[PDB]
Ligand binder design. Sequence first.
Ligand SMILES: Nc1nc2c(ncn2[C@@H]2O[C@H](COP(=O)(O)OP(=O)(O)O)[C@@H](O)[C@H]2O)c(=O)[nH]1
Ligand SMILES: [Mn+2]
Ligand code: NA
Ligand code: NA
Length: 365
Amino acid sequence: SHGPSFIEYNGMKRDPLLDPTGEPEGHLWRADDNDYAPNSAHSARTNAALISLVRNEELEDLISTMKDLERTWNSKFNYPWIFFNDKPFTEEFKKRTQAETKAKCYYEQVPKEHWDPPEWINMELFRESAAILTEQKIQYSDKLSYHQMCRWNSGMFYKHPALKNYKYYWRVEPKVQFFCNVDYDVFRFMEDRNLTYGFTINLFDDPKTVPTLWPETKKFLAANPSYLSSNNMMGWLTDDSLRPDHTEAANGYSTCHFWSNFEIGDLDFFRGEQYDAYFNHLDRAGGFFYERWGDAPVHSIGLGLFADAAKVHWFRDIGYNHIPYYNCPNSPKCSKCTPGQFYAGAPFLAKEDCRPSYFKHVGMH
Ligand SMILES: Nc1nc2c(ncn2[C@@H]2O[C@H](COP(=O)(O)OP(=O)(O)O)[C@@H](O)[C@H]2O)c(=O)[nH]1
Ligand SMILES: [Mn+2]
Ligand code: NA
Ligand code: NA
């Protein structure tokens, strides 16, 4: 039912999001019988934050997103917002953001050492490969800042001092929508089940952004054979049954990834020996700059090799949109999205859904 449709892979045959979609099983922490007051010193909140790497110029789009996340979820639970930026935030940014939430807002700068390219990266080599990707890649002109952002999300956010006493994060981007009321504490849902990571959307990537990522990953694994987990996602990571030309073009990696603009995650996974050694290996290989390795494929590969796949969760009940893709469940808690409609735009977008592979090789849990 959740298998691939062919006409040429053409997306999912029958989207599970069409099924009546409710809450996960087990105990859930509710706002109506706990202390989730925004300024309570004895609240039911665990050590978690809503986080966002964002620019001053994206303020209006950030505010739209905050309104959705607050209305659907955080107005009841009042977890803090922590904003990150390589540059200082304006006073207008601080005032407008704090006005949209009863929770505490924090405003952090990314340190130069977590943002600047490392000393070993040759900037002339960067510029040469960037010019080629600019020429080849659809609706894409290269920016150094994009590479710095990918590297920051891949290896640096979990090392920021502001997050030292936090264990869980919910990553948020500007200009995204949330469609469904969520009536349980998602962070304590994660914590009580020892979950590592949560996603809403699962996509193919552009192989041109990651051609040596899998080769470099295999090198890392050969040097560290004890790191591979037993409940791993090798089948999903190496799948070639849906779009074999992607897997060939990315030299053994399917290119499928959790779409990282949305993430609910355990910071201590990424801080761990295995993942962080993987990041440092990739950092020294140079592909964050000489290629355009996204944090999504890097997170996805790291999770798929080093996490317990049983501890990765599809948040099917969180209605979500970052242009042009959707996770819209069939639930009376949702409005303003079409259940099971994966994309908005041209029909060639349908083939970008990788869930039929993920659900086959890993599952729908
Ligand atoms: N502070 C800062 N944030 C950035 C920069 N580049 C990207 N971002 C943020 O990183 C996330 C991803 O960037 P975005 O432009 O949405 O890329 P896309 O979602 O892949 O198109 C968003 O939350 C952006 O606000 C940057 O140079 N500085
Ligand atoms: Mn974005
Ligand atoms: Na309450
Ligand atoms: Na281009």
